[PDB]
Protein backbone atom coordinates (compact mmCIF):
# COMPACT_ATOMS: atom_id res chain seq x y z
CA UNK A 1 0.00 0.00 0.00
CA UNK A 2 1.72 3.11 -1.29
CA UNK A 3 -0.75 5.92 -1.97
CA UNK A 4 1.88 7.75 -4.02
CA UNK A 5 0.61 6.87 -7.47
CA UNK A 6 2.81 7.31 -10.49
CA UNK A 7 2.07 9.47 -13.49
CA UNK A 8 1.10 6.40 -15.56
CA UNK A 9 -1.00 5.00 -12.71
CA UNK A 10 -2.67 8.40 -12.24
CA UNK A 11 -3.63 8.63 -15.90
CA UNK A 12 -5.02 5.12 -15.66
CA UNK A 13 -7.19 6.04 -12.72
CA UNK A 14 -8.50 9.15 -14.48
CA UNK A 15 -9.20 7.43 -17.80
CA UNK A 16 -10.83 4.58 -15.92
CA UNK A 17 -13.18 7.02 -14.18
CA UNK A 18 -14.00 8.39 -17.61
CA UNK A 19 -14.89 4.93 -18.77
CA UNK A 20 -17.08 4.15 -15.75
CA UNK A 21 -19.06 7.34 -16.34
CA UNK A 22 -19.39 6.65 -20.04
CA UNK A 23 -20.73 3.15 -19.33
CA UNK A 24 -23.27 4.66 -16.98
CA UNK A 25 -24.44 7.12 -19.63
CA UNK A 26 -24.54 4.35 -22.19
CA UNK A 27 -26.66 2.20 -19.90
CA UNK A 28 -29.00 5.10 -19.14
CA UNK A 29 -29.30 6.05 -22.82
CA UNK A 30 -30.06 2.51 -23.94
CA UNK A 31 -32.56 2.31 -21.09
CA UNK A 32 -34.18 5.59 -22.17
CA UNK A 33 -34.69 4.47 -25.78
CA UNK A 34 -35.97 1.18 -24.45
CA UNK A 35 -38.89 3.04 -22.87
CA UNK A 36 -39.77 4.50 -26.26
CA UNK A 37 -40.66 0.95 -27.26
CA UNK A 38 -42.24 -0.09 -23.93
CA UNK A 39 -44.65 2.82 -24.33
CA UNK A 40 -45.67 1.74 -27.81
CA UNK A 41 -46.50 -1.55 -26.10
CA UNK A 42 -48.64 0.05 -23.37
CA UNK A 43 -50.33 1.97 -26.17
CA UNK A 44 -51.06 -1.23 -28.11
CA UNK A 45 -52.79 -2.49 -24.97
CA UNK A 46 -55.07 0.59 -25.00
CA UNK A 47 -55.93 0.22 -28.63
CA UNK A 48 -57.04 -3.32 -27.76
CA UNK A 49 -59.06 -2.25 -24.73
CA UNK A 50 -60.66 0.44 -26.83
CA UNK A 51 -61.18 -2.17 -29.53
CA UNK A 52 -63.21 -4.43 -27.25
CA UNK A 53 -65.22 -1.61 -25.73
CA UNK A 54 -66.08 -0.49 -29.28
CA UNK A 55 -66.69 -4.11 -30.33
CA UNK A 56 -68.94 -4.56 -27.34
CA UNK A 57 -71.03 -1.39 -27.79
CA UNK A 58 -71.48 -1.90 -31.56
CA UNK A 59 -73.24 -5.18 -30.93
CA UNK A 60 -75.79 -3.87 -28.43
CA UNK B 1 -45.20 -4.28 -35.83
CA UNK B 2 -47.31 -6.13 -33.22
CA UNK B 3 -46.59 -4.50 -29.87
CA UNK B 4 -49.07 -6.44 -27.73
CA UNK B 5 -47.05 -8.25 -25.04
CA UNK B 6 -48.23 -11.20 -23.04
CA UNK B 7 -48.35 -11.14 -19.26
CA UNK B 8 -45.14 -13.16 -19.11
CA UNK B 9 -43.43 -10.78 -21.51
CA UNK B 10 -44.54 -7.68 -19.53
CA UNK B 11 -43.24 -9.05 -16.25
CA UNK B 12 -39.88 -9.66 -17.99
CA UNK B 13 -39.65 -6.09 -19.22
CA UNK B 14 -40.48 -4.56 -15.82
CA UNK B 15 -38.05 -6.93 -14.14
CA UNK B 16 -35.33 -6.07 -16.65
CA UNK B 17 -35.90 -2.32 -16.32
CA UNK B 18 -35.36 -2.83 -12.63
CA UNK B 19 -32.17 -4.75 -13.23
CA UNK B 20 -30.80 -2.11 -15.57
CA UNK B 21 -31.56 0.59 -13.02
CA UNK B 22 -29.81 -1.44 -10.32
CA UNK B 23 -26.73 -2.00 -12.47
CA UNK B 24 -26.63 1.78 -12.78
CA UNK B 25 -26.95 2.26 -8.98
CA UNK B 26 -24.20 -0.27 -8.49
CA UNK B 27 -21.68 1.28 -10.88
CA UNK B 28 -22.35 4.71 -9.44
CA UNK B 29 -21.97 3.53 -5.85
CA UNK B 30 -18.76 1.65 -6.54
CA UNK B 31 -17.46 4.73 -8.30
CA UNK B 32 -18.39 6.84 -5.26
CA UNK B 33 -16.31 4.55 -3.03
CA UNK B 34 -13.43 4.47 -5.48
CA UNK B 35 -13.14 8.27 -5.30
CA UNK B 36 -12.76 7.93 -1.54
CA UNK B 37 -9.59 5.96 -2.20
CA UNK B 38 -8.52 8.23 -5.07
CA UNK B 39 -8.70 11.13 -2.62
CA UNK B 40 -6.30 9.39 -0.27
CA UNK B 41 -3.89 9.30 -3.23
CA UNK B 42 -4.31 13.02 -3.84
CA UNK B 43 -3.84 13.78 -0.16
CA UNK B 44 -0.81 11.48 0.03
CA UNK B 45 0.85 13.43 -2.79
CA UNK B 46 0.34 16.52 -0.67
CA UNK B 47 1.95 15.08 2.44
CA UNK B 48 4.89 14.27 0.16
CA UNK B 49 5.10 17.85 -1.09
CA UNK B 50 5.12 19.11 2.51
CA UNK B 51 7.95 16.69 3.21
CA UNK B 52 10.02 18.13 0.39
CA UNK B 53 9.30 21.82 1.20
CA UNK B 54 10.25 21.04 4.74
CA UNK B 55 13.30 19.02 3.61
CA UNK B 56 14.42 21.82 1.36
CA UNK B 57 14.00 24.58 3.92
CA UNK B 58 15.72 22.51 6.65
CA UNK B 59 18.86 22.25 4.53
CA UNK B 60 18.08 25.69 3.01
Amino acid sequence: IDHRLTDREWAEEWKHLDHLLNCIMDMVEKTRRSLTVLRRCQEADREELNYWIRRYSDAE
Amino acid sequence: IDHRLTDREWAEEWKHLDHLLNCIMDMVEKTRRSLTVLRRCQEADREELNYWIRRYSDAE
Binding site: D2, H19 | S34, L35, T36, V37, R40, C41
Partner: peptide, 11 residues
Protein backbone atom coordinates in the same frame (compact mmCIF):
# COMPACT_ATOMS: atom_id res chain seq x y z
CA UNK C 1 -0.95 0.18 -5.03
CA UNK C 2 -3.98 0.49 -2.74
CA UNK C 3 -7.07 -1.70 -2.94
CA UNK C 4 -10.11 0.31 -4.02
CA UNK C 5 -9.13 2.60 -6.91
CA UNK C 6 -11.44 3.63 -9.77
CA UNK C 7 -9.79 0.86 -11.80
CA UNK C 8 -10.56 -2.39 -10.03
CA UNK C 9 -14.25 -1.62 -10.68
CA UNK C 10 -14.18 -4.13 -13.55
CA UNK C 11 -17.19 -3.38 -15.80
Amino acid sequence: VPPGLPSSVYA
